[PDB]
Amino acid sequence: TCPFYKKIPGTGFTVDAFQYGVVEGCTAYFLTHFHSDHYAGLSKHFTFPVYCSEITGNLLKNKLHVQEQYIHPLPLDTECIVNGVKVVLLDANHCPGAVMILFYLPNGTVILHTGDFRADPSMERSLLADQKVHMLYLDTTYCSPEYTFPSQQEVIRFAINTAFEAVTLNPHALVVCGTYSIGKEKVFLAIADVLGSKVGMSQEKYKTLQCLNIPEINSLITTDMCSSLVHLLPMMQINFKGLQSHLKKCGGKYNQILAFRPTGWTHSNKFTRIADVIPQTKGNISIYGIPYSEHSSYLEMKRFVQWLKPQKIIPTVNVGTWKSRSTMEKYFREWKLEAGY
Ligand code: NI
C-alpha cells in the first residue's frame, strides 16, 4: 500500500509510486527520474498514463519496454495542464532527465515535490521565484550537518588531473570507472576528453547512454573496447580481484590500472580534503573513491529551504526511523527560527 508522502492531496496524482499495484484513486502516475528505487514496478505491461521528462520517457520505452501510448513526456520550464491541473517540470540537478514537479492545486495551494535533487542557487531564478509554496516534499537524503562534500567541479578537477598525470607517466596504463545506474557521467566523460579517447563500454550501457540527449555523444562513447583507454565496468567489479581479471582480457595492451569509484558521501569526508585524497593500491592496481554527489549537501539543502520559505515540509527520505524523523524535524524548526518565516 502506497505511503502518504507519495500522494498529492487534492489531485488524482502519485509520485514515484509504481510498486504498490493499482493505487485507488490515481488517474496519473508521475515519475521524477529513472533510478530503480523510484521506477520499481514499471514494465511493458503497465497500462496507466505515466508523466515524466523526455529523457525519462526515452529510457522507459527502450530499457523497460513501456508501450508508447502510455508515455506522456513534458517539456521543462513550461506550464502544462494534466487532468485539469496546472503543472511545471523543473531540472533537479540530479541524473539526466531528473525533475522537480510544481502542482498548482484547484483551491490555490502550491506544492513543490523535489524528487531527488542537488540544490543549487541557480534554482532561486527558475519559475520558483514568482510565487509562494505551501507544501514542500523534500529529498532529505543528507539532512544532517556531518554531511559535507566538495563541489562537483572540484571533484572533476581532481579526477582529470589524476588521470592525465598517471597516463602521461605511463602510456600503457588503462583507466577504469565504475557505474550502476545513470547519473555521474561527467566523471568518465571528462577523463576520456583529457586523454583524447572515447569511453569504452558494454552494449547494454551504450544503449542507456544513447537515450540521454547528450550533445555530440556519438563522438564520446563506443562499444569497441580495443580502441579505448577509458573503460566502464559495473560498480561491483571495482575491486582488486575484478580489476585483475579485467586486465587479463585486454591482451597485453596495458600493464597498470587506475580505477575510480564515484560514491556519495563517506566518513573519510569528515577528515580528508579532496586535494589530499589517496588511493588503495595492490601491485599494479590503484582505486580512488571520489565523493561525487548528485544529492544536496546539508548546507545546500538548508539554503534552498530558507530561500523558499515553505509553510510545511514533508520529508521523502530517512522516514523509516523515529530517530531520523526527530532529527529532521529539529533542523526544519532551527532553519525557520533563524530565517524568521
Ligand atoms: Ni535518485
Side-chain angles (χ1 to χ4, degrees), residues 32-38 94-95 98 115-117 139 294-295:
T32 62
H33 69 296
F34 194 75
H35 276 167
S36 65
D37 277 353
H38 305 257
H94 188 53
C95 61
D116 286 346
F117 87 141
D139 169 14
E294 292 187 334
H295 291 276

Side-chain angles (χ1 to χ4, degrees), residues 13 27-28 30 51 72 74 80-87:
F13 303 153
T27 66
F30 284 78
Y51 288 81
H72 297 264
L74 309 169
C80 295
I81 304 303
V82 176
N83 298 352
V85 177
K86 181 162 69 158
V87 308

Side-chain angles (χ1 to χ4, degrees), residues 176-191:
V176 180
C177 293
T179 191
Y180 44 27
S181 62
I182 63 167
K184 310 189 183 184
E185 286 82 6
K186 195 64 171 173
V187 179
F188 56 83
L189 294 168
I191 288 169

Side-chain angles (χ1 to χ4, degrees), residues 201-203 205-215 217-240 242-247 249-269 271-273:
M201 63 199 64
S202 66
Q203 291 188 255
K205 182 84 183 173
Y206 181 92
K207 183 181 171 175
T208 305
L209 297 188
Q210 289 291 160
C211 305
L212 307 180
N213 295 347
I214 286 167
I217 195 74
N218 294 332
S219 70
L220 324 161
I221 59 167
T222 187
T223 53
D224 178 8
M225 307 290 297
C226 292
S227 68
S228 158
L229 63 132
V230 178
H231 293 173
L232 303 189
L233 289 185
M235 198 72 89
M236 296 189 73
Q237 190 157 17
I238 310 305
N239 54 69
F240 295 123
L243 300 166
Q244 283 166 195
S245 179
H246 188 69
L247 194 51
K249 298 164 208 133
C250 292
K253 204 156 192 304
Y254 308 108
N255 63 6
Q256 181 182 350
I257 285 177
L258 183 126
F260 296 92
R261 299 174 352 81
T263 63
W265 181 87
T266 70
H267 188 46
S268 61
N269 273 278
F271 301 129
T272 309
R273 283 188 138 61

